[PDB]
Design a protein around this ligand. Structure first.
Ligand SMILES: O=C1Cc2cc(Nc3cc(Cl)ncc3Cl)ccc2N1
Ligand SMILES: O=C1Cc2cc(Nc3cc(Cl)ncc3Cl)ccc2N1
Ligand SMILES: [Cl-]
Ligand SMILES: [Cl-]
Lengths: 122, 4, 122, 4
């Protein structure tokens, strides 16, 4: 018999993104080639099957630095990290292949699905 | 607020 | 020119609640009278003006244990902690006064507003 | 997915 606040989840995610932009309580650095991205482990796990697996591992859960596979493009990662914290995906003709490959690697099934749909249309 |  | 995934914020919050239920990556204990509640600092900050102030403080940001004011009712806190992680508020005739008082203390303005509306109706 |  609960009541529900429709905008609560969106407002929580907006505040988590504000903490990210101000580098507050970020507990991990994701290294993609030369590029470094600071984030919250919980948000990464909530969005990605790959980070979920990494941070539930008894040894990796304690690492402050995670290095991604050298084939991963920093821009594709940046677009996906922004999507994790905002629900908005900056999908463009020039980045769609790098975004799909990065989403497949990160195990972000809904991003993979829309990339496959957008590629099929073109 | 809504009835979910 | 982004696209948006409507269910993303709700899915993120659902996964954060699953991490909470399994005690994964919880980094703080909130003590309310004798009762203890494990949670994620980022989620608490995203939902509450009081926790936002506490965990942006250079000294308090590093505490693993936070003791609330002894007037705070553990059940009122439990109902609000569940709301933080689910968007669902278990508001009942027998708990509304304790829920409103706890929401005022935690600075959760939308919960305070609905409690004031529900009290006025009765 | 939608146009926000
Ligand atoms: O496409 C995706 C997105 C995703 C997220 C998570 N993260 C969780 C899943 C569960 Cl059941 N509990 C907690 C968490 Cl944080 C796992 C796999 C995938 N695949
Ligand atoms: O009723 C409320 C809910 C709430 C949440 C937060 N938390 C933040 C606010 C900002 Cl601007 N950036 C980041 C965070 Cl985590 C502060 C005050 C209040 N009042
Ligand atoms: Cl996804
Ligand atoms: Cl609120």
């Amino acid at each position: 018999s609960c009541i529900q606040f429709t905008r609560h989840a969106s407002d929580v995610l907006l505040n988590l993104n504000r903490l990210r932009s101000r580098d507050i309580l970020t507990d991990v650095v994701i290294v993609v080639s030369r590029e470094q991205f600071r984030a919250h482990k919980t948000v990464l796990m909530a969005c990605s099957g790959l980070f979920y697996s990494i941070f539930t591992d008894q040894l990796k859960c304690n690492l402050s630095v995670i290095n991604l596979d050298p084939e991963i493009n920093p821009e594709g990662f940046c677009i996906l990290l922004d999507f994790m914290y905002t629900s908005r995906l900056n999908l463009r003709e020039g980045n769609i292949m790098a975004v799909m490959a990065t989403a497949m690697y990160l195990q972000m099934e809904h991003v993979v699905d829309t990339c496959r749909k957008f590629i099929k249309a073109s | 607020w809504v009835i979910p």
